[model samples]
Target: MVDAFLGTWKLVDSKNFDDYMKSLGVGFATRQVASMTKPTTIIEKNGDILTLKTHSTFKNTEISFKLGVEFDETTADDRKVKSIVTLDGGKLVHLQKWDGQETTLVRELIDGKLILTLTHGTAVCTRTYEKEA
Candidate 1:
């Protein structure tokens, strides 16, 4: 059912979330507020199609796509920009455009941990997520 793909997954814990935000040029105070937040990832899955909603008390972001389909992404939290994502070899690959800059990010599950990686201007930031029951 891929129900594994749905529900409000709590932070349970995180690593490098602050670093990732810093790499994005998020300021100190904003980063402080951001770091204090325990965001939740809510996924609504219908067969191969999925809607992923990442929510925080201050900001909420969401994206929708099918298993192998590609589409542009624009949502909350991060800077306003356009992006496209595709499922390749099981990992989800997202190519993002911001302020005329392009970056690639990927999300994958390894050893029961959800890993997120972002690349921009030769700098890469990695963040990890754990699913909460």
Candidate 2:
């Protein structure tokens, strides 16, 4: 649905988020507290190009990518990790190369909820965010 993929939105809430960040190498100390804050995301899509910027009182981040274009994306307070993301059948998939091996991150919207899934090393995390108009 284009409605889920377009327009400006804010993160009203999140769920099952612990594993999602762990997969990205987020430290326990950070995840412990980071999980409490409700992050907000604003998305703008112009045709096949999309820009998503998520922010919270504690931290903020932004991302811009094309439909088929692959680019590096980093996350967390300091963006200590990097991954290349692509859109596959409405799911935003990330392919990260670490230690010469590739890992995957998947994100999609279901039942008005945003679900993020990641895998790599001993970390596999999922985070869900509610959309705000």
Candidate 3:
């Protein structure tokens, strides 16, 4: 299952994304810019370390962490958060906590598509991605 994420994926669509950004406490200006950015997600693994990256015209960010180990990470928009990516119940679950605020990003392969669901507070955003390589 983890092997499915070991490649490049391009964003195809996002739903309620603005609300998801708002839940992250992002501001107005950057939110608009981020909303327009269709970032590419790249995942690579070496030994026990996994590198997760995002690149786009607007911003680029990368974080390396071991499975189930929480590590400090900086968001593409510059927010600092503690993140942990784990294979929980055979599913990829990414959890981030910042200033007591937490968000969960879950990636599940569905119908040959990578479906990412981001949840924070009461807001939920679903982003669809397709394999590119």
Candidate 4:
């Protein structure tokens, strides 16, 4: 089930990412840098624990947690949030809540590619990644 997500993925393209950042009130200069970054995500699963690491020139972020368990999270944008990851219909769904804001991030494998969707406020960003050899 969740084992399918255990692999390295490279960012290929993104849509509406800038608006996604703006929904979080990110500054213009910061959003520009963020949009230019090409991120690599490595996911590993061991028993009930899962670890996800995102590497980029701008900043690196990592989160390790058990599925269905809530944990304190500090996002790459420096927002403190309560986060949880769950399995849903073959997708790894991540939910975060903070300061009356809720964000949903879903990662799924489709046609040998990794698709990541982020929804916050009224903005939704979809990013596609290629599986690494």
**TM agreement with the true structure for every prediction:** 0.75, 0.72, 0.94, 0.97
lDDT of 4 at 102: 97
Candidate 4 matches the true fold with a TM-score of: 0.97
Model 1 pairs in collision: none
Rank ordering of all candidates by TM-score, starting from the highest: 4, 3, 1, 2
lDDT of each: 0.71, 0.67, 0.89, 0.94
TM-score winner between candidates 2 and 4? 4
lDDT per residue for candidate 3 within 2-36, as digits (tens), equals 78778999999999989988877788988899788
Candidate 4: tens digits of C-alpha lDDT, residues 16-122: 99999999999999899999998999999888889999999998999999999999999999999999999999899999999888999999889988899999989
Per-residue lDDT over 1-133 for candidate 1, one digit per residue giving the tens place of the 0 to 100 score: 3444356667655566666666678778887887778788776877667888888887788788775555667645456667666766677777778778777778777787677777766567766777877
lDDT of 2 by residue, 1-133 (tens): 3447555455554545676667656789888888887777677777776787877877788877775566666655455345656778888776766457566768788897777665666666566666666
Higher-lDDT candidate of 3 and 4: 4
- Look at candidate 3 and tell me the lDDT of residue 107: 93
Name the candidate that leads on lDDT. Answer: 4
Clashing pairs in 2: 19-125, 20-125, 20-126
Q: List clash counts for every candidate, in order.
A: 0, 3, 0, 0
- Candidate 4, position 127, lDDT: 98
Put the candidates in lDDT order, highest first.
4, 3, 1, 2
Off by over 4 Å in 2: 1-3, 8-16, 19-24, 80-82, 98-103
